[PDB]
Amino acid sequence: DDEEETYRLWKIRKTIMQLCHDRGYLVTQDELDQTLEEFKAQFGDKPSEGRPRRTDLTVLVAHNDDPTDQMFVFFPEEPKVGIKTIKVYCQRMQEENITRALIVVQQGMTPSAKQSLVDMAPKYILEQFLQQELLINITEHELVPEHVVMTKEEVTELLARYKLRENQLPRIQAGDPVARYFGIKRGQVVKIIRPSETAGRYITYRLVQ
Amino acid sequence: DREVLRVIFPTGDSKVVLPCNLLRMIWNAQKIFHINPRLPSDLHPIKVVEGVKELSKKLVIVNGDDPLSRQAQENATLLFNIHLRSTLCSRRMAEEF
Amino acid sequence: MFAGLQDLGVANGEDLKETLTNCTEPLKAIEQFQTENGVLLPSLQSALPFLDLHGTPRLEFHQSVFDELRDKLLERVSAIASEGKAEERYKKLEDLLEKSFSLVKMPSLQPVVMCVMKHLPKVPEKKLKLVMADKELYRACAVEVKRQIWQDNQALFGDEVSPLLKQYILEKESALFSTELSVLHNFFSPSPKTRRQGEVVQRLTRMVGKNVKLYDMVLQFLRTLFLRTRNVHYCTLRAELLMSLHDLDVGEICTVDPCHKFTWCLDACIRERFVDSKRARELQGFLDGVKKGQEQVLGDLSMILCDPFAINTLALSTVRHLQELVGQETLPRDSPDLLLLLRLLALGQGAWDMIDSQVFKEPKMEVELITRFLPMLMSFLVDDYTFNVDQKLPSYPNTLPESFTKFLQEQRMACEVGLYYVLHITKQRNKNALLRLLPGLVETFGDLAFGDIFLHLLTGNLALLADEFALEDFCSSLFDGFFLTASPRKENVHRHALRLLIHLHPRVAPSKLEALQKALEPTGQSGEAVKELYSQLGEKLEQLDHRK
Amino acid sequence: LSEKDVDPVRTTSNDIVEIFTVLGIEAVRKALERELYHVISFDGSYVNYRHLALLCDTMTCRGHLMAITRHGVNRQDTGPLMKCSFEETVDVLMEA
Amino acid sequence: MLVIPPGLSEEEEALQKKFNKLKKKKKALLALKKQ
């Protein structure tokens, strides 16, 4: 089909825009809430054997606070990404001066690709994202409370206030869907805001490990 | 505070669990001092306002003046403070109690 | 007081006087004259008695109607500002101003004209000049109108901002000299957004607003002050004002300025405390966009790059890439971004030179700098690494070439880079290379080693190295090699020495404590701040001696 | 959840492991609390929220679903003696 | 315009020699860590 593919591409694009907005990257208001119709009109309404193909709607976004912190979002064509595709993506990012990529695969990439991706991490950080995980925005689910990423200074302020070491905080693993949504790395602390039926509102903290 | 409750309590279930049974203590106060809820009383409403405000400062759960500490203290007794304000209203103290 | 009702044909107080003078029977004249002048409401004639039956004057009635209709006119003019198509609503506003400006001075109908000329996209210039003619109308103008009209009057704006300029300079010169010294809590510690959170910055953002002429006036003022005084705080003011305008996303100012993006980026650099390959690369890409006839902007661009915070950020970035090259065993010429930082620092430091000389051509760099200076400090760092290795292996050679001192004395880039690497290694507790490079700090470019930036950062770093202050050798070497050379004539050096002695006296040995006390007793030729610092030092040391 | 005309906000799944893998550790905590409340208040009784909250917080304190069995609480680093107090005493003693 | 000579300068050569010495010492140290 082509109509369902158009719907899928629009949906994943919308979720990527929301994710970039959540991380603090500068996403304009108009493209954040562009409905299906303008997407169809501007990209092509015919992904199958048509101009709205992949690698055409890849997006670079710059950080709102810092103009020189940017992220590519790529949509590879081959269902199973191999070493060649991530290698050419590395090459493309090489002439650019940016170090952050967001891959949206259609099926799980090859184990060699994952191993190279995790070996590449210290200089060039990039993540994979199955398109199935992107058809919905999980932070809008009622079960997922408010997640906020905490700066290092306020983490130190927390630790000083409660006089506890970082290993005594509750933990969250980097493989968590919300953790991957916010792209947080180890040693980084997340504030969590919940509505409580006994207090009214409860704030807890989680250390990424 | 009404809007805050409505976003904490969807489906409109007002049965909550709280420390002090305010209505029963109001009834006790009415019966101890022989209030006679038929004659006009001598209770300046600003006394009600200031009394609620100064009571809210004494019920401390998180102790400290740090902004983090103040936020934690405010969040800990948010629900009870909402209930206290919704009960000890100047109008409710002026026409019902 | 009816200046303007003569244009509408409204009979005025003079007409009342002449009718009362040429009157035969008062009832006729007064009644007819003010009843034709009264509110022509058909049903109003029945309301008049009932108002005054209790004795309540009908003036209260008319004033109540006036106030209610004033509320209504304010709401309706706000609705005009909100609703209606642009062309029709602008034309309506223009016509309504044209037929209502006759009563602009009257405080009764002032809100009408004030809101109308507030909501106009472009108020007629003749009426703007007339408003500027009357001080009351000028003071009553809204912020939008004041933005719209502040074009010709430059003396008034200069006088308005001069106390703000003075207070800003005093704040920037007092933050550097703060009684508390620390590396993390220093002058450059607050983010540019936090630096703009000040009341002065918000007042200046409100004052400048969206007007191009006001922005250019501020640019000229700051350029002239920087030219006269060589005070780099004007650079920080210009950058903060430009970023505060950027935060509002004012199109009429940001779009016309190519430097607004650069200033936003540079303040981001300051916020991140570093310049990576990305930052230097994009700053190069923007700098190379010098089109024909736009070379003057370079000077103004240099005006942005002469920010003390920006200079600190670029020099610390140079230090970090130098350490990275030491770790990587790679030359600076194999990393173009370090040379990019050097060029950026050169433009920032030569901002004043290019502004004074008015030559809008990029100054050139001598190659001996890169061929000898940076390899020398990298040799020092490699020597420290070799000492560490040989310590682990089952002495540290501190041979300092004098061309280090020569480069620091003559070259501005060598001065900045060497001073910042000294700061970094003093923060790093790198005692050996600190003693190695200390005799080279006696003379630098324009006493940048004795300047406020480096002296504050050095005091902050030594506050971390207070433990070494217990030993006599460390304090003796540091003081004799840096402070005692410029102590008797330079106020800033002696003030920084006094602050360091105050803040690090718990560790200093009693012999060195007393030696520094004798070396730091000010005479009558020093300022009052010196006396205050001496009084604080005496109190602290007396309290310490009381603990015995 | 990705199907059209399906609410992606209110749709739950009664399964804690699936919710953990899809939505995260806080979502599984809230869902686990709701499931315990449903299974306990089904008879019409009442147990104070503090006890469910404490149980759920201990169950999901380490970022992964900690089962209350020996495989969940003995793998947590709490000391050989209380571990042998629970189960497989001599085994954990030999390991220690 | 910035121009850099193709040849290696005096201090560059000394720095590269010290790079070589530090590299050899650190490789010997790592071999010791192997032992």
From Swiss-Prot, chain C:
Keyword Repressor (UniProt): yes
Expressing tissues: Widely expressed. Expressed in heart, brain, lung, placenta, liver, skeletal muscle, kidney and pancreas.
GO BP annotations, alphabetical order: cell population proliferation; negative regulation of stem cell differentiation; negative regulation of transcription elongation by RNA polymerase II; stem cell differentiation
Location of N6-acetyllysine modifications: K512
Keywords: Acetylation, Nucleus, Phosphoprotein, Repressor, RNA-binding, Transcription, Transcription regulation
InterPro entries found in the cross-reference section: COBRA1 (IPR010405)
One MF annotation (Gene Ontology) recorded for this entry: RNA binding
Subunit structure and binding partners: The NELF complex is composed of NELFA, NELFB, NELFCD (isoform NELF-C or isoform NELF-D) and NELFE; the N-terminus of NELFB binds to the NELFA:NELFCD subcomplex. Binds RNA which may help to stabilize the NELF complex on nucleic acid. Interacts with the first BRCT repeat of BRCA1. Interacts with KIAA1191. Interacts with NELFE.
Biological role stated in the UniProt entry: Essential component of the NELF complex, a complex that negatively regulates the elongation of transcription by RNA polymerase II. The NELF complex, which acts via an association with the DSIF complex and causes transcriptional pausing, is counteracted by the P-TEFb kinase complex. May be able to induce chromatin unfolding. Essential for early embryogenesis; plays an important role in maintaining the undifferentiated state of embryonic stem cells (ESCs) by preventing unscheduled expression of developmental genes. (Microbial infection) The NELF complex is involved in HIV-1 latency possibly involving recruitment of PCF11 to paused RNA polymerase II. In vitro, binds weakly to the HIV-1 TAR RNA which is located in the long terminal repeat (LTR) of HIV-1.
Protein's recorded name: Negative elongation factor B
Organism of origin: Homo sapiens
UniProtKB/Swiss-Prot annotation, chain E:
Species this chain originates from: Homo sapiens (Human)
Similarity annotation: Belongs to the RRM NELF-E family.
Localization annotation: Nucleus; Chromosome
Whole sequence portion shown: 1 to 35 of 380
Lineage top rank: taxon: Eukaryota
Name the record gives this protein: Negative elongation factor E
Tissues expressing this chain: Widely expressed. Expressed in heart, brain, lung, placenta, liver, skeletal muscle, kidney and pancreas.
Domain statement: The RRM domain interacts with RNA, and is essential for NELF complex function. It is however not required for the NELF complex formation.
Known role: Essential component of the NELF complex, a complex that negatively regulates the elongation of transcription by RNA polymerase II. The NELF complex, which acts via an association with the DSIF complex and causes transcriptional pausing, is counteracted by the P-TEFb kinase complex. Provides the strongest RNA binding activity of the NELF complex and may initially recruit the NELF complex to RNA. (Microbial infection) The NELF complex is involved in HIV-1 latency possibly involving recruitment of PCF11 to paused RNA polymerase II.
PTM characteristics: Phosphorylated by the P-TEFb complex at sites next to its RNA recognition motif, promoting its release from chromatin. Sumoylated.
Coiled-coil residue windows: 7-35
Quaternary structure and partners: The NELF complex is composed of NELFA, NELFB, NELFCD (isoform NELF-C or isoform NELF-D) and NELFE. Interacts with NELFB. (Microbial infection) Binds to the HIV-1 TAR RNA which is located in the long terminal repeat (LTR) of HIV-1.
Organism placement in taxonomy: Eukaryota, Metazoa, Chordata, Craniata, Vertebrata
